[PDB]
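Running co-folding for magnesium ion.
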Amino acid sequence: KIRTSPTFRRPKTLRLRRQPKYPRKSAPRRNKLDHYAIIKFPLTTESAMKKIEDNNTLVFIVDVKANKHQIKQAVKKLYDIDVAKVNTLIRPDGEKKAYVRLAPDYDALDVANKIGII
Amino acid sequence: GRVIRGQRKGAGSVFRAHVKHRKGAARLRAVDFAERHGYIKGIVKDIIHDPGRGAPLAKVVFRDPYRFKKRTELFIAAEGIHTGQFVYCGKKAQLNIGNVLP
Amino acid sequence: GYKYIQELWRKKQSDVMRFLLRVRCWQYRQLSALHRAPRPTRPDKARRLGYKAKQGYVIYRIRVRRGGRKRPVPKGATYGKPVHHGVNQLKFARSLQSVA
Amino acid sequence: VRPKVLMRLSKTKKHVSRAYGGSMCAKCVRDRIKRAFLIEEQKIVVKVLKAQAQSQK
Amino acid sequence: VVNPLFEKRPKNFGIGQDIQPKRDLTRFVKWPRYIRLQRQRAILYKRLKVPPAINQFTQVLDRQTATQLLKLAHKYRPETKQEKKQRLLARAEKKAAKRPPVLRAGVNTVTTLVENKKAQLVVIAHDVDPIELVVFLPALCRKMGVPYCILKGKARLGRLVHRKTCTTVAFTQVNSEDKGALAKLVEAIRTNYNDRYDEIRRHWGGNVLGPKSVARIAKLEKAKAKELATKLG
RNA sequence: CGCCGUUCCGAAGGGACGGGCGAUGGCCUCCGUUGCCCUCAGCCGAUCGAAAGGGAGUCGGGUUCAGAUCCCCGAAUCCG
RNA sequence: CCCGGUGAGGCGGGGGGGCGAGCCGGGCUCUCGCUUCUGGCGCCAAGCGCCCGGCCGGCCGGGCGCGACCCGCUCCGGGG
Ligand SMILES: [Mg+2]
Ligand SMILES: [Mg+2]
Ligand SMILES: [Mg+2]
Ligand SMILES: [Mg+2]
């Protein structure tokens, strides 16, 4: 095996994988960003009631650490309603308002009638 | 008394050179086997004006005798150099203008 | 045996020990400033200073620059009474061995 | 177009169909094919005139 | 039958003619620091004037005497870890219903029995890392009249015992049958180490310049020898 | 305490195609996976530094008491 | 110990090849070892030798040496 290049580069050795003899923490920490903690309450303001009535949307005060993906997949769990799109914004109050726009056939005004806000 | 202006030059931070728009250190080609026992031929790609320097620089372009690659080098341009000219370097190089030899 | 290496390491002005201490010092001058040694260079002096050849005992070799302690102050200007104008010829109160 | 727009266009919109197409002008293409054939030709002439000298001498 | 297509295409590896081939450069490599360090400490051990006390470790046992030596030093190896237990068991059932002569290992024991004159032959490893551990043993053997010999390799001296490395080994006693081989070795050893101790204590090693710089002097000397060889007529 | 230093006293690449061996999941056909060698590999220095530098890709109309190239409608567009 | 350079890339001897001074096909002094008309291309092997591996001397597919002289103790130099 001749040295073709004048640069001795470090040879690559073998690298094993962690086979621990005991897990550090005993139990996996439960997911504290539950489908319920991710949606606190709705809004009943005529700035969102015109969205419900006209734009066929809903306005939730979601957790601030929530993605539009977690929101979509958690309204499709708490309310079983397919979602058109989600538009979030953090208020000066600090909470994250979220405008969820329902699929064409699903009626916001008629799922807010169900869940209580009307 | 205040550190005089002459003394304030050794620290720097104001008196450093303005090496922003400069094209690189104008240095000769390193010595290799070719340059040590024969001659190596390169061409002159261009002659540029380096800022903050009265002389012009010349991009001389050889080809690596060991790899497949075209090496660039920044010489200082002797007078009479033109573009597309051939510059030879090494021990067996002939003796004309721009022809670095021992 | 150990008293042979002991009485040998006292003739540092001899030929063999001035060759050994010099090839050692040359090789040490090429390594890092603080590096772990594989085994005690002086096994006798190490026993005398408490080194049992068992697991857990480690030997680090370390080099330190000789000379006094120049005072860390501006150019000259140690603002004070002429008593404390000394910077150059000062000495440190802890040995270079304690600094190692 | 801008550099990052080139991922949109098709290869025919980016090169002309010729040797060294869209990376060298035609004049300097022909004026390089010429110099190539001519230099290799003179290298052949000199190769001949080498053993022509070695034959007598 | 030859095919007129398979042309022969030779390359010209002249200056500037064609790219040099993937040659061998194990000489010009930039090595790691530890490699270059030990490679030029082996050179400092050729440039520096080595005192005879350290130089007396290069004159070592040959390759033919070594074989027979380890042949005799294989019948007297210490017991293993398992043989120690199986001897505690055979001693147990011995109680229910002499120590053989063996080798002897370690400097602290070899020196302490060379002073007691108990040894009959001492083998010393030629490459002890800090040489101070065996710098004195040569002279203590010569002084006590004990037949010592230097063997090449403390990693082959360390296979006699069942450890990684050993430093010295001592034959105190041997069985009847092997006393003849021991007397056929002690002769060829004492005539090679103890007899010539005067000329071993005087022989400085090292002090030899590198060939690149001894040829630059042998050339100049050659020019000035062929000067008087050619100017006389 | 730390400071100097940014390619300088360094074994500084954990990557890729192909091949051989080995395992795996399924139209176990044929691709994909990861384990081991073989082959190949330059670089130039971790990282940070611009809401005015570089930087693919959205426009019209409607709408609020306060938001619109962001919401509604209608037309597009980039990247994967 | 210091300095400069480089992806520490052909260093020192020895051998092998050609030109000229010479003695009468054989030993020495020498030197060279392949690039100067042009703004082109130039790697990732041709070739010869040796072996092996599957299907039927014939298809298929691998490896080793030469090509690309041998031997060496500092990477080369410059200081010291
Ligand atoms: Mg671990
Ligand atoms: Mg710093
Ligand atoms: Mg950044
Ligand atoms: Mg910007």
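Result summary
The first helix of chain C runs from residue 2 to 8.
Chains C and D do not touch (no CB pair under 8 Å).
Job closed.
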